Structure 1
Amino acid sequence: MAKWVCKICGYIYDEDAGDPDNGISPGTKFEELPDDWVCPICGAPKSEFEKLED
């Protein structure tokens, strides 16, 4: 699945890993994250992520 980088701090949201400590099971696509999910390291909103693909 896809990976998305937090442009502020460099954390990688990996769809394969999810973010289970913050309520997100493995296999959850970035588009399916709740509107108020934020980067677990720096607190940046979803707007500040970029998908790692051309």
Structure 2
Amino acid sequence: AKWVCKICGYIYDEDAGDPDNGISPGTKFEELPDDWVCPICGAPKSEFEKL
């Protein structure tokens, strides 16, 4: 799945993960740490919408 940061437009792609911030590819959004935030704008998970 992809999820979009409603603040900045960043797309969290679960296939890509977010390895620079400790997230391996294939990590589902729901598996992201509570303290993970948009690596662009720092918005919390609450500001993401699933596409």
TM range, normalised to the smaller chain?
over 0.9
| TM-score of the superposed pair, with normalisation by structure 1 | 0.94
Rg bigger for which structure? Answer: 1
Deviation at 1:13, TM superposition (A): 0.1
Structure 1 runs (4+) greater than 2 angstroms displaced: none
Deviation at 1:49, TM superposition (A): 0.1
Deviation at 1:31, TM superposition (A): 0.1
Number of positions where the alignment pairs a residue of Structure 1 with one of Structure 2: 51
2:27 counterpart SS class: coil
d(CA) in 2 for partners of 1:27, 1:43: 21
Q: CA RMSD in A?
A: 0.1
Deviation at 1:42, TM superposition (A): 0.1
Unpaired runs of at least 5, structure 1: none
Deviation at 1:38, TM superposition (A): 0.1
| TM-score of the superposed pair, with normalisation by structure 2 | 1.00
Deviation at 1:46, TM superposition (A): 0.1
